[PDB]
Each structure stands twice: as structure tokens, then as C-alpha cells.
Coordinates of C-alpha atoms and ligand atoms in Angstrom, one line a residue:
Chain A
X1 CA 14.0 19.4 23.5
X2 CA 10.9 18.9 25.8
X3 CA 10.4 16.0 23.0
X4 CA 12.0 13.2 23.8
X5 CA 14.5 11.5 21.0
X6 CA 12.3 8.5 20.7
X7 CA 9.7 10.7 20.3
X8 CA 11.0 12.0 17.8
X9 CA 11.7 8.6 16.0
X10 CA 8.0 7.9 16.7
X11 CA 7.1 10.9 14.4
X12 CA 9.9 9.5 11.5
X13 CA 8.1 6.6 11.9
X14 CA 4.8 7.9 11.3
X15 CA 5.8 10.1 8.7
X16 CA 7.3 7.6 6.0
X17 CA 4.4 6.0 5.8
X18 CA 2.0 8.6 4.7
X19 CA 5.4 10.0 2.8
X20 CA 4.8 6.5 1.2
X21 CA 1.6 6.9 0.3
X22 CA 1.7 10.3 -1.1
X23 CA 3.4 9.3 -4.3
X24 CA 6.5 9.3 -3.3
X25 CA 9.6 11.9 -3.0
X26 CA 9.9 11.4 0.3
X27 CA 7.5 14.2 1.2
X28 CA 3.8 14.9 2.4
X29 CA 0.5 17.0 1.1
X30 CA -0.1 19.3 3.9
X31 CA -3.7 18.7 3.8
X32 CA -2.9 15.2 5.3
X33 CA -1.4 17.4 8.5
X34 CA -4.2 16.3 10.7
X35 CA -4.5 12.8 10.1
X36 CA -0.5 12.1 11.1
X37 CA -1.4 14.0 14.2
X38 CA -4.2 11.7 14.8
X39 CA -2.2 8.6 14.5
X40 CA 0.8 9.7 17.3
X41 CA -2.1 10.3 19.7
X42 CA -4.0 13.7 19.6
X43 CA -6.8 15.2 19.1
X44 CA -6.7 18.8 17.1
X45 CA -9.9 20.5 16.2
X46 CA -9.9 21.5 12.7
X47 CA -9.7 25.3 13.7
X48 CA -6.1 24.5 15.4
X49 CA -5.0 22.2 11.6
X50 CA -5.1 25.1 10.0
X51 CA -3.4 27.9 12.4
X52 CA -0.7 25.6 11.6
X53 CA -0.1 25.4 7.8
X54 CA -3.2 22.5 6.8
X55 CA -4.8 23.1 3.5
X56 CA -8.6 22.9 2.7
X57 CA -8.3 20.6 -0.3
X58 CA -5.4 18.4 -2.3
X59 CA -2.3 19.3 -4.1
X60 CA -1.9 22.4 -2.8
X61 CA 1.1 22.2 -0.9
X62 CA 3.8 19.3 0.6
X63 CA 6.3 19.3 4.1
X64 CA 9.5 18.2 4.4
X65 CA 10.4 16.4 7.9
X66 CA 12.0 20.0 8.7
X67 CA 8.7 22.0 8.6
X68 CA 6.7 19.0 9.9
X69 CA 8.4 18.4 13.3
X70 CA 7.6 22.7 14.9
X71 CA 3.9 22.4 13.4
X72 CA 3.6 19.0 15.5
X73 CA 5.1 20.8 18.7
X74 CA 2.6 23.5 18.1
X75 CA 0.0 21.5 18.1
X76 CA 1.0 19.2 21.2
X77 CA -0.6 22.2 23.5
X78 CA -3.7 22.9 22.5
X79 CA -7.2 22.3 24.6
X80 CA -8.6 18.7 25.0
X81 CA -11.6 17.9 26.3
X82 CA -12.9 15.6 29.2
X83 CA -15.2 13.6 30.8
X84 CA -17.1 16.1 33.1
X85 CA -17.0 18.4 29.9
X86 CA -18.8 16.4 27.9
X87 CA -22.0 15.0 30.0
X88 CA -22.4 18.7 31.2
X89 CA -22.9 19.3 27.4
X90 CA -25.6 16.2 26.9
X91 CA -27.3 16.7 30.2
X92 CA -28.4 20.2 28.4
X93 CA -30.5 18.1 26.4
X94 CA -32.1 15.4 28.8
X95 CA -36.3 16.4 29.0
X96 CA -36.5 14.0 31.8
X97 CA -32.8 14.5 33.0
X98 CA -33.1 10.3 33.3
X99 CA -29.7 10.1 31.2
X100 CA -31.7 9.3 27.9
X101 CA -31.9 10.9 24.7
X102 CA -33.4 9.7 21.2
X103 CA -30.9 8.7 18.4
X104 CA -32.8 11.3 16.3
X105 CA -31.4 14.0 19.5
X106 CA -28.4 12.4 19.3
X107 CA -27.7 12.4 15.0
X108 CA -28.9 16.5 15.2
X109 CA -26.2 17.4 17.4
X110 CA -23.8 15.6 15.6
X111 CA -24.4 17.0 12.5
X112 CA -25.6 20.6 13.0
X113 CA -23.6 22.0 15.7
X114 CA -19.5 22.1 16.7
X115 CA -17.6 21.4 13.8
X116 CA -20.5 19.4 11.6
X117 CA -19.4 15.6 10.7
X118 CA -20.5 13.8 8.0
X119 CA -23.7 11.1 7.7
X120 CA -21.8 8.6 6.8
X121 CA -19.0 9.4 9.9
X122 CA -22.2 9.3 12.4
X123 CA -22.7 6.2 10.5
X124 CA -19.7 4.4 11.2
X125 CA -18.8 5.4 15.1
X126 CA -22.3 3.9 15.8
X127 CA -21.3 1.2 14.4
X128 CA -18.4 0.5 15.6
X129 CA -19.4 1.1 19.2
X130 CA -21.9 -1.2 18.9
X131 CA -24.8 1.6 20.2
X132 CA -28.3 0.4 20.6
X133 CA -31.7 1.3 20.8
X134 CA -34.3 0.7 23.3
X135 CA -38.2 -0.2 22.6
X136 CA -39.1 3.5 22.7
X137 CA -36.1 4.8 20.8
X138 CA -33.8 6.4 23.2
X139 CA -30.4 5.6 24.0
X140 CA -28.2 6.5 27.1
X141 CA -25.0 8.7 25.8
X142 CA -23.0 8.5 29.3
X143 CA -22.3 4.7 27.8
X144 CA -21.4 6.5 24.4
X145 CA -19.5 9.4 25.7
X146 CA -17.0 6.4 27.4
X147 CA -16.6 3.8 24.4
X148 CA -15.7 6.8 22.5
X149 CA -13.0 7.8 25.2
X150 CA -11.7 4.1 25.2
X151 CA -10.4 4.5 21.5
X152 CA -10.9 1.7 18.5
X153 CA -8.7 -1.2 20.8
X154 CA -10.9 -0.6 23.4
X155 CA -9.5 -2.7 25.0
X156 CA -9.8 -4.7 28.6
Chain B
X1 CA 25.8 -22.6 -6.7
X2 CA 28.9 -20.2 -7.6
X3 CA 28.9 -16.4 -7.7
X4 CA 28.5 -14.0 -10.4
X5 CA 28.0 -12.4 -7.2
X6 CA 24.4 -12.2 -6.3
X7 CA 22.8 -15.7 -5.2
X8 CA 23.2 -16.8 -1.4
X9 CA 20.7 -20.0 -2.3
X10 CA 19.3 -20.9 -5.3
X11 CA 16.3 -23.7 -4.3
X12 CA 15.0 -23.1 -8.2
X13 CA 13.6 -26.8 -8.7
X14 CA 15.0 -29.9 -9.9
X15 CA 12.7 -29.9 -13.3
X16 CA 13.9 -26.6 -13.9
X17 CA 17.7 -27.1 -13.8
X18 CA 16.5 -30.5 -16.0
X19 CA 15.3 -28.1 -18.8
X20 CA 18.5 -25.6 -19.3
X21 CA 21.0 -28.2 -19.6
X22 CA 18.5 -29.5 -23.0
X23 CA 18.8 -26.1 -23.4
X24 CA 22.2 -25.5 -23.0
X25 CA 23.0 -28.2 -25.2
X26 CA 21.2 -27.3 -27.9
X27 CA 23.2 -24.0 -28.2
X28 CA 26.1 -25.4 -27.7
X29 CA 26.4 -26.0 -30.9
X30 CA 29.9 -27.0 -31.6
X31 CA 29.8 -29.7 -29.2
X32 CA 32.7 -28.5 -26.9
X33 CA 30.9 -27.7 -23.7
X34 CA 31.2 -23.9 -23.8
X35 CA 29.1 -21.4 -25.5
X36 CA 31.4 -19.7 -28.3
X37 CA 30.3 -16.3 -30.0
X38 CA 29.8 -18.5 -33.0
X39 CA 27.6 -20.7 -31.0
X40 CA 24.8 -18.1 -30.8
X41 CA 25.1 -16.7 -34.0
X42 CA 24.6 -20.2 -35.8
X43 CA 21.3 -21.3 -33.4
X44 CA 19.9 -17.8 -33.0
X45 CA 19.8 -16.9 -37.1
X46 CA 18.2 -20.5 -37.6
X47 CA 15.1 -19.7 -34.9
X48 CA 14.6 -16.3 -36.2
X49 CA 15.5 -12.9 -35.4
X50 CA 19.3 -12.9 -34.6
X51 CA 21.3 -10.3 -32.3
X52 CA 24.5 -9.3 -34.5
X53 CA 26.0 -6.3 -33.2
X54 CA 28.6 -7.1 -30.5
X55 CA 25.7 -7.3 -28.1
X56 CA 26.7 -10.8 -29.1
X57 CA 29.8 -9.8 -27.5
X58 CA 28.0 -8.0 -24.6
X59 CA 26.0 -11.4 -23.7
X60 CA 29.5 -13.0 -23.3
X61 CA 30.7 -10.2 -21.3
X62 CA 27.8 -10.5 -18.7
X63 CA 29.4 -13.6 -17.6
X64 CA 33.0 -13.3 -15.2
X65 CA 35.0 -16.1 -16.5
X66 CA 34.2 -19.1 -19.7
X67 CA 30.6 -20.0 -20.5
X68 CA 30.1 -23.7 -19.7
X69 CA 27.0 -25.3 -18.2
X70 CA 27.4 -24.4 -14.8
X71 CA 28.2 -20.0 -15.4
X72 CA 25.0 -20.6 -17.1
X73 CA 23.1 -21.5 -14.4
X74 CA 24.2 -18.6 -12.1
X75 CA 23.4 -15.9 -14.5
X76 CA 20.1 -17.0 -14.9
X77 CA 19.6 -17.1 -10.9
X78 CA 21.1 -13.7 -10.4
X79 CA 18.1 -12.8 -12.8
X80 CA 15.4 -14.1 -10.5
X81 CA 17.0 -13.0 -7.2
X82 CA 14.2 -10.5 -6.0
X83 CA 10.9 -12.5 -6.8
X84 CA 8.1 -13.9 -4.5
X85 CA 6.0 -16.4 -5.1
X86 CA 2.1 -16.9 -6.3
X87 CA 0.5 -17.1 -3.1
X88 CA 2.2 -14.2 -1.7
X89 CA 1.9 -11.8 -4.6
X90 CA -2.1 -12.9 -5.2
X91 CA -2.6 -12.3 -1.1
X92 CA -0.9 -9.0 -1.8
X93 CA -3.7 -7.9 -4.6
X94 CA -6.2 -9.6 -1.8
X95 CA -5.6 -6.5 0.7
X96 CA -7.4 -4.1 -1.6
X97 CA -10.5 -6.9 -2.3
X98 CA -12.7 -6.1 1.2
X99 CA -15.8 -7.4 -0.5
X100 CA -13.6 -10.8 -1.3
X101 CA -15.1 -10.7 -4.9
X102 CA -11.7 -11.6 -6.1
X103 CA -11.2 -9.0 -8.4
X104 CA -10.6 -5.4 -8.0
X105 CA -11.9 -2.6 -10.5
X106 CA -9.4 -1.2 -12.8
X107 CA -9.4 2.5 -12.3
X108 CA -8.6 1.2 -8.6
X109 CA -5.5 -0.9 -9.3
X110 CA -4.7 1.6 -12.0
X111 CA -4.4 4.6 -9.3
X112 CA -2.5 2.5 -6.8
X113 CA 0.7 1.7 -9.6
X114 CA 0.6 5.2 -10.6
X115 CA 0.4 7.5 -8.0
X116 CA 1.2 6.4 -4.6
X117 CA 4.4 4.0 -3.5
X118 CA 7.3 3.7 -6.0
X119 CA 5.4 4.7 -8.7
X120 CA 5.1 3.5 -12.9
X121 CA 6.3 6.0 -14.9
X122 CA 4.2 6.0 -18.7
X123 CA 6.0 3.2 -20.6
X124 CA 6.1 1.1 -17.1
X125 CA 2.3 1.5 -17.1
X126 CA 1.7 0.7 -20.6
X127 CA 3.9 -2.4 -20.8
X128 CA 2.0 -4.0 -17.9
X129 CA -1.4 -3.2 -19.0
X130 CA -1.2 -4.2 -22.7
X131 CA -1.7 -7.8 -21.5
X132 CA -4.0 -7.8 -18.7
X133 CA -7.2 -10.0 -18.0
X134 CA -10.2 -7.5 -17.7
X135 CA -13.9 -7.5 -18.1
X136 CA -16.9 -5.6 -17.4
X137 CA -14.5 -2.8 -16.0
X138 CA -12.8 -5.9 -13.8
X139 CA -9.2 -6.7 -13.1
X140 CA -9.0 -10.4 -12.5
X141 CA -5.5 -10.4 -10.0
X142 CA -5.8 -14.2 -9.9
X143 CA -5.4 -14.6 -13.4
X144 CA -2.7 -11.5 -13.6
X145 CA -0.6 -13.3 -10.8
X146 CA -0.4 -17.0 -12.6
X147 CA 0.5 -15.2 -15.6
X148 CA 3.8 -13.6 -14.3
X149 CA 4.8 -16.6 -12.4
X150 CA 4.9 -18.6 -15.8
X151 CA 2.0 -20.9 -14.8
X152 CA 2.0 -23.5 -17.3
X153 CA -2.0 -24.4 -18.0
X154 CA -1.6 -23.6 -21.3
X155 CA 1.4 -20.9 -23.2
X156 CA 1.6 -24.1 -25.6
Chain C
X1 CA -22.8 34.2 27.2
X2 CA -21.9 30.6 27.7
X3 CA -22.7 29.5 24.8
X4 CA -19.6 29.5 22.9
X5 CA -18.4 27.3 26.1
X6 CA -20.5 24.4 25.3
X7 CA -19.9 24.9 21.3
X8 CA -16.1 24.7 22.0
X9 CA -17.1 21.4 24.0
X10 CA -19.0 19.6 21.4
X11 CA -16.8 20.7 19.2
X12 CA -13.6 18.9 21.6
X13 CA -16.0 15.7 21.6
X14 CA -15.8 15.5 17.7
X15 CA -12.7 16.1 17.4
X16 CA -12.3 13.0 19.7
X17 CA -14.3 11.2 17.0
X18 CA -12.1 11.5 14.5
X19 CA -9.1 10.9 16.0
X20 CA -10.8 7.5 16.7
X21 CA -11.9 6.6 13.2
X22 CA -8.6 8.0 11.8
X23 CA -6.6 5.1 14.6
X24 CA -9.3 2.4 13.5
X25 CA -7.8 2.5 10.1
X26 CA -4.0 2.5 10.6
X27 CA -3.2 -1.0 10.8
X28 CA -4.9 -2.0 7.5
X29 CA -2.4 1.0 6.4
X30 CA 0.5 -0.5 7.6
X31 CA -0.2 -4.1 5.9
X32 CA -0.9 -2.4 2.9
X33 CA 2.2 -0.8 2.7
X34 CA 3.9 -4.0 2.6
X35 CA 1.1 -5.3 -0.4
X36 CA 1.7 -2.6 -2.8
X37 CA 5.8 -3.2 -2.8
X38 CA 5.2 -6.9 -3.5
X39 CA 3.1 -5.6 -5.9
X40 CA 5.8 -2.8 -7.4
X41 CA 8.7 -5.0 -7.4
X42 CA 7.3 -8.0 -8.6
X43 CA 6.0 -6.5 -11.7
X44 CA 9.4 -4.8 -12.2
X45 CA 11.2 -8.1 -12.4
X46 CA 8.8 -9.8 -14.7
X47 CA 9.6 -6.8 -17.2
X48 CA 13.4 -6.9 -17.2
X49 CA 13.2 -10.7 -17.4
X50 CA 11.2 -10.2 -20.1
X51 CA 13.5 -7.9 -21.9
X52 CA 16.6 -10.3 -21.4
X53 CA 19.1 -11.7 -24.5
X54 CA 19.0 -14.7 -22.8
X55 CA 15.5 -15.2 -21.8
X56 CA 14.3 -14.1 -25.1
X57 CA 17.0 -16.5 -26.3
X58 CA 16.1 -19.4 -24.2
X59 CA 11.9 -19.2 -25.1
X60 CA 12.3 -19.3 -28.8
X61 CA 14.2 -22.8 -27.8
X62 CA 12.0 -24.3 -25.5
X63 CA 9.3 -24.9 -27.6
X64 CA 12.0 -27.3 -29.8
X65 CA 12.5 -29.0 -26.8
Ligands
MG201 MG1 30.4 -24.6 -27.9

């Protein structure tokens, strides 16, 4: 009840459409847990997807609205990060401390660290954030760090 | 225009009403104005293959009231009461085309009937497929969507 | 020590990334949605017509018209 009952129509809302999606019975793969999560605004770690009933792969199990709606209240107050968090983590690896870093820096901390993402995921924030290289090929990540933080309608 | 309870407005062209009442006439073939049992029976075993159980009786029954020109026409409507036209449906097919080849492969389209939305059953699936436009593994929508609508380039 | 610290943190910052790509791609979800019905129920009516007395009545006529 801390949910408010347009919240809660918010989350109907959001779960027909992947209930659509799923080959329909009016019902949802729990390995698609995370993604409806994404879409009403947060953003879980992996670790936290699964301390909640998410699946590693397919077809291995489905929700009804009933078991959806406590997994999404679980989930609601968990850790997320911030601004100050995050440069204190890049700063750790400035050389000259100018606020640079090379994209080759920037791609091995992306995919080696944390929870590893994919080549082709570092591929397509950078291009949708429209990053850029400079003549000796190094790139400032406080202006990364804050298009990230602005989300996809980025907008202003 | 009346109700056999379905159609609010029937805009179905001008050179399609044209057609059916050549149509009509020519299975009316006692001359009367209204389509008898005996009608159907004479025309239908003189085209061809000839319906002769009382499913002759069942075609009669689908109409509420005596068979003249005008219960014809609103049975047919009430038949296409549901339907979209071509632009609409080949924009739909368009949605799933991101390189704009205008085409889309078939295991894709074949996937999206089956196993996500209100999906085919097996005899849905084969029914559709048995006459589709494809080569070098490529479903041509545009084609697929005159098709259904009845286009008339050439079904001579 | 702290090390686990910064890990969570980089980890947070991904996570962040994802939510982003995941948003990105709703709306073409939504719009598709609406395609594939089209698609669905459009098909469906072409094969009842197609099994119909009357229709299959009314093409074996046409062609003497
Ligand atoms: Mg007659």
C-alpha cells in the first residue's frame, strides 16, 4: 500500500505488453523480469534479478500478475548509484588526473570488470551518446558519466 | 444498409455493389427476385461442384428474413466487417523492415505468426503459407498484401 | 579493503546502462504491438472469407460475368 493505485495500473500496463509478446496466455517468462523493471524506471543489478525469481536462460519458468507485483516491490529498494559515485570510480584511473582517459581505458573497464557487458552493448551506448575522440585518442568521461544519467530522451 | 446485425457503415464502392446485383441475377434463376433453395441448386450443379446437403438449407438460414437483392448485400458486408486496408496492412509488415529492403526473411515473419501475439495454430500456418511470394529465402510483404486485398492486376 | 566498494560502483554504473538501452527500445515496442494485430487479424479474415458458401459461390460466377 506504499504503491500507489496508479502505480499499480502503470505496472498492468507494462505487463500486457511483454504478456503480449511472450506468446500469449496472458503470462510472462521470468527471465524477461529485468527488462519490465527497466521500463517502469529502475535500475537492478543482475545480482538483485535473481534474488528475486529471474532465470539465466528461456523457457524455464512464466509469472502471473500475482507473483509479479511482491518481486517488483522487492526490488523498488535496492542500491542506486550516483553522480559523486561514479567520477570517484574514473578519477582512479586518470595518469594525469586532467579528466581524460583513452577509449581503449574506457572499453577495458567496461568489459572486464563489474558485471561484464557485451562488445556489441559498448558498441551501441557510444553510439548513441554521440562520444568522440580527440586527435591523441582520449576522451573526457565526466561528459559520459552525464549523457548516460540523462536517459535515451535526453532531453532539454 | 439494414442489419443482419453487424454493419454501422458500409462505404464498400459503387463498382462493387455494380457487380453482385449481375451476380445476384444470375442466381436468381427463376426470375422472381428472391433466391429459392432451388435457385442454388440449378446454378451451382451447372458451374461445378454443388453443395447438396441442407447446408443448402444452412446458406438460407444465415439470412434473418427472405433473400432478395438487398439481404444479399448485408450478409456479404457483415463478412468484411473487421478488415483494413492495403496501405495500412503493408505499413504494418514495414515495422519489422529497418533496412527498408522491402522484404523481410522468412524464418523472421515465420516466428512472429507463430509464437508471439495471438498466435497460428498448425493448419492456420499452413493455409497461409501454401501461397506465399518467396525467394532466395525472402518474403515479399508487398506482394503478400495486394494478394489478400484482391488486387486485380491479373487473377484473370 | 575497498575494493569491493568501487566494484559494487562500476557495477551500479552498468546497470544504469542497461536500463538505458532497454528504454531506447520501448517505443518501437509499443508500435509493433499494434503491427502484428493488423497483421493477425487481417490474415484471419482473408481465411474465413475464403472458406465461405457464398464467396466460393459468388467466384465460380464472376468469371461468367
Ligand atoms: Mg428466385
Amino acid at each position: 500500500p506504499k504503491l500507489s493505485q496508479d502505480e499499480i495500473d502503470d505496472l498492468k500496463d507494462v505487463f500486457e505488453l511483454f504478456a503480449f509478446w511472450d506468446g500469449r496466455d496472458g503470462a510472462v517468462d521470468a527471465f524477461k523480469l529485468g527488462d519490465v523493471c527497466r521500463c517502469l524506471g529502475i535500475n537492478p543489478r543482475n545480482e538483485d534479478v535473481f534474488a528475486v525469481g529471474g532465470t539465466h536462460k528461456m523457457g524455464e519458468k512464466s509469472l502471473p500478475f500475482e507473483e509479479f507485483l511482491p518481486a517488483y516491490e522487492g526490488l523498488m529498494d535496492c542500491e542506486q548509484g550516483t553522480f559523486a559515485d561514479y567520477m570517484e570510480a574514473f578519477k582512479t584511473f586518470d595518469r594525469e588526473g586532467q579528466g581524460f582517459i583513452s577509449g581503449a581505458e574506457l572499453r577495458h573497464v567496461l568489459t572486464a570488470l563489474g558485471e561484464r557487458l557485451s562488445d556489441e552493448d559498448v558498441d551501441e551506448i557510444i553510439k548513441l551518446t554521440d562520444l568522440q575522440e580527440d586527435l591523441e585518442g582520449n576522451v573526457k568521461y565526466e561528459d559520459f558519466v552525464k549523457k548516460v544519467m540523462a536517459g535515451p530522451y535526453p532531453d532539454k | 444498409a439494414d442489419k443482419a446485425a453487424s454493419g454501422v457503415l458500409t462505404k464498400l464502392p459503387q463498382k462493387q455493389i455494380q457487380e453482385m446485383k449481375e451476380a445476384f441475377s444470375m442466381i436468381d434463376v427463376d426470375r422472381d427476385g428472391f433466391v429459392s433453395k432451388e435457385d442454388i441448386k440449378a446454378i451451382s450443379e451447372q458451374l461445378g461442384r454443388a453443395p447438396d446437403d441442407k447446408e443448402l438449407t444452412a446458406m438460407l438460414k444465415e439470412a434473418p428474413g427472405p433473400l432478395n437483392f438487398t439481404m444479399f448485400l448485408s450478409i456479404f458486408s457483415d463478412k468484411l466487417s473487421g478488415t483494413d486496408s492495403e496501405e495500412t496492412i503493408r505499413n504494418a509488415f514495414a515495422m519489422f523492415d529497418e533496412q527498408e529492403t522491402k522484404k523481410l526473411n522468412i524464418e523472421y515473419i515465420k516466428d512472429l505468426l507463430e509464437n508471439m501475439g495471438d498466435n497460428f495454430n498448425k493448419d492456420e500456418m499452413r493455409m497461409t503459407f501454401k501461397e506465399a511470394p518467396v525467394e532466395g529465402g525472402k518474403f515479399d510483404y508487398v506482394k503478400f498484401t495486394a494478394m489478400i486485398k484482391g488486387s486485380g492486376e491479373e487473377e484473370a | 579493503m575497498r575494493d569491493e566498494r568501487l566494484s559494487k560502483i562500476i557495477s551500479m554504473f552498468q546497470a544504469h546502462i542497461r536500463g538505458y538501452l532497454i528504454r531506447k527500445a520501448y517505443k518501437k515496442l509499443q508500435d509493433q504491438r499494434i503491427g502484428l494485430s493488423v497483421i493477425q487479424r487481417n490474415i484471419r479474415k482473408w481465411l474465413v472469407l475464403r472458406n465461405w458458401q457464398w464467396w466460393k459461390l459468388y467466384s465460380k460466377v464472376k468469371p461468367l460475368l
